[PDB]
Ligand binder design. Structure first.
Ligand SMILES: CCCCc1ccc[n+](CC(P(=O)(O)O)P(=O)(O)O)c1
Ligand SMILES: CCCCc1ccc[n+](CC(P(=O)(O)O)P(=O)(O)O)c1
Ligand SMILES: CC(C)CCOP(=O)(O)OP(=O)(O)O
Ligand SMILES: CC(C)CCOP(=O)(O)OP(=O)(O)O
Ligand SMILES: [Ca+2]
Ligand SMILES: [Ca+2]
Ligand SMILES: [Ca+2]
Ligand SMILES: [Ca+2]
Ligand SMILES: [Ca+2]
Ligand SMILES: [Ca+2]
Lengths: 362, 362
């Protein structure tokens, strides 16, 4: 929408900055400079830019609600774009690692970075660290004289921590939690006791909600200097609700949306993930169907996978998702009404975010 | 080792903080807390603690020099221990990843983290991110009301960046740099045209000197509030010299120090990495020797690795290292004497660091 063109211009600026700083500081040669350019473009581009563009929608909503001159509005928007790129590059970094962890094939319609034959998991592992480091470099450089530098770093780093703990819950969700010893191999579960609504919510809140919903909102507020003009606790709550839903959508599109339209080949089923479908199925389905699920789940065999999808379809998981979505919409709507009573400007930028989220198809 | 007891007590302190904060903020369960505890202990302990201890030695030298009273000195030492642990965790993070990247077997006399049977490289990859995040968490918590907080973050993230570019030079150094395409597999070199003193210096200065020499000295100065009492240029210079040399010793020991004494099993020869021995040997040995080294280096075959070590031995590599160490001793001493003319206290703390480095055996 409104800010794409400006946001993409800032990408070019920030890339030239970053590559030039490496030349100046690290004696970066021409070939590695180009490798780094292709790496940044491959990992950071091609997504929907929902997190980055939110920073800009929020910042501008709040800046217009303030009285400021042309140069100050221009500054807010530019800083917002830089902040948005910190988050997109945080995403880039998380996706490089997660694609390795999940041993996946495609991301955003192209092979996963680690799967580029001129890269491999060995180089990709270090490329991911460069991405994370650059996001902090952006703040240190662009916001060196800004009052919100310290607060930006604190929220960005807190969120980076939060997401790694989220990923921890995710990556250990298929193993009995009583059996984690860094000294003993552990088999995947066969009984699925821990596939509970509580465990699924815990995963999604921490691995997705904080960095996808909370971070863009807060950063938008930080760069426009209006973080003390909104109810902190309601902002966190609406971000948790939308974020949980956003990840329920993800765990509901990797089992029913063609890879081709999504841009990625989910393997929740093969990998026995504690997805919203698995928890919803395990807690509502009849007993023979639960057993048949346990004999088929967690299996690479395409015939086992097809059995799970058939069981999910018989269980009416799409319709259960529709009902959950109605409940979410009801709650979001009212959290937004209450934010609107306090700060109508901020509440509008929450609608813009929610609009890009509700009933999305990829 | 005046500060070891205090340093270790701070580790217990910081660990209990970190685990407790995840309980409070991420609904961390008792099993993953236990997992996290063992991960921390396994990846962060068992090293020599040169980096961490140097922060405290520098901080104390400067606090004595500025005549701090007992209250102030106790704060400075405690802050210095936290900074020290930020660096030891940075190291922890770097080695978790590097062990994966290098496919190594032992770190500090135990199996590499990713090789723990209950871990695997899948989990280790996210674990390494938790270590990095925790490093920032320490500063955000303990230095929340400290004016040096921003400069601590700044130098920390800069050095982390520098090291990852350092690591990029390392992992791409055995492939032809003109053939650095992400779309095209890269065969390892057969002619070694890029195995030069310039390329070797660039690798080790960036992957090693910054975080191992410069980062500890600076943090010791920042926490004691004395960074504005020493020559920044001379400080950086002496860090670069000691740090390159520190990497040279690490390269010499890969080939000549028994894995047992060392705590690790280097595969420089098998991976044919741009070490200080290979580079020197190539630009010191003849053509017949160079040709025999080209048809032996980069092979996992035990006989071929024995040929390499035998070439090195016959080319008197140990002896060329002694001579190199003489020139470095002459130059470090001159640079310390120069520092000592300006602030005797900081120069003495650079000597403490030098003396734990010069002629170390592991
Ligand atoms: C290292 C943090 C990885 C964080 C993270 C958080 C949320 C989603 N992902 C990737 C998704 P996907 O690969 O985009 O479908 P997941 O594997 O379903 O969770 C990664
Ligand atoms: C991943 C970031 C850089 C990691 C890094 C930096 C310096 C030395 N090391 C490890 C050593 P070692 O594995 O301790 O011998 P190297 O593999 O010889 O370089 C790792
Ligand atoms: C958060 C998680 C579901 C990963 C996918 O995030 P996304 O769908 O926003 O991906 P893009 O960055 O490619 O838009
Ligand atoms: C820089 C590189 C040689 C890394 C190993 O560093 P180190 O020998 O200081 O390791 P410890 O932290 O185990 O003492
Ligand atoms: Ca994934
Ligand atoms: Ca995943
Ligand atoms: Ca998914
Ligand atoms: Ca190594
Ligand atoms: Ca290495
Ligand atoms: Ca080594």
């Amino acid at each position: 929408m409104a800010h794409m063109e400006r946001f993409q211009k800032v990408y070019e600026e920030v890339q030239e900055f970053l590559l030039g700083d490496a030349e100046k500081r690290f004696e970066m040669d021409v070939h590695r400079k180009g490798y780094l350019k292709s790496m940044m473009d491959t990992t950071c581009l091609g997504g929907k830019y929902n997190r980055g563009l939110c920073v800009v929608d929020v910042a501008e909503a709040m800046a217009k609600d303030t009285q400021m001159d042309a140069a100050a509005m221009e500054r807010v928007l530019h800083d917002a774009c830089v902040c948005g790129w910190m988050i997109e590059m945080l995403q880039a970094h998380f996706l490089v690692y997660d694609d390795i962890m999940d041993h996946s094939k495609t991301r955003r319609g192209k092979p996963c970075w680690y799967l580029h034959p001129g890269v491999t998991a060995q180089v990709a592992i270090n490329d991911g660290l460069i991405l994370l480091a650059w996001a902090t470099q952006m703040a240190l450089h662009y916001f060196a004289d800004r009052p919100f530098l310290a607060e930006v770093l604190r929220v960005f780093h807190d969120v980076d921590l939060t997401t790694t703990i989220g990923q921890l819950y995710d990556v250990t969700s298929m193993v009995d939690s009583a059996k984690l010893d860094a000294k003993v191999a552990h088999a995947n579960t066969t009984d699925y006791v821990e596939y509970t609504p509580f465990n699924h919510r815990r995963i999604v809140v921490y691995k997705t909600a904080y960095y996808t919903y909370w971070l863009p909102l807060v950063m938008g507020l930080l760069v426009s200097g209006t973080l003390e003009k909104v109810d902190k606790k309601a902002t966190h709550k609406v971000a948790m609700v939308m974020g949980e839903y956003f990840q329920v959508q993800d765990d509901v599109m990797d089992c029913f949306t063609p890879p081709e339209k999504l841009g990625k080949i989910g393997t929740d089923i093969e990998d026995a993930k504690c997805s919203w479908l698995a928890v919803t199925f395990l807690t509502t389905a009849p007993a023979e169907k639960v057993a048949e699920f346990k004999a088929n789940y967690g299996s690479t065999d395409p015939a086992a996978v097809a059995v799970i999808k058939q069981l999910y379809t018989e269980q009416n998981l799409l319709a259960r998702f529709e009902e959950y979505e109605k409940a979410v919409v009801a709650e979001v709507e009212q959290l937004i009404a209450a934010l609107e009573a306090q700060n109508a400007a901020f509440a509008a930028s929450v609608k813009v975010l929610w609009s890009k989220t509700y009933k999305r198809q990829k």
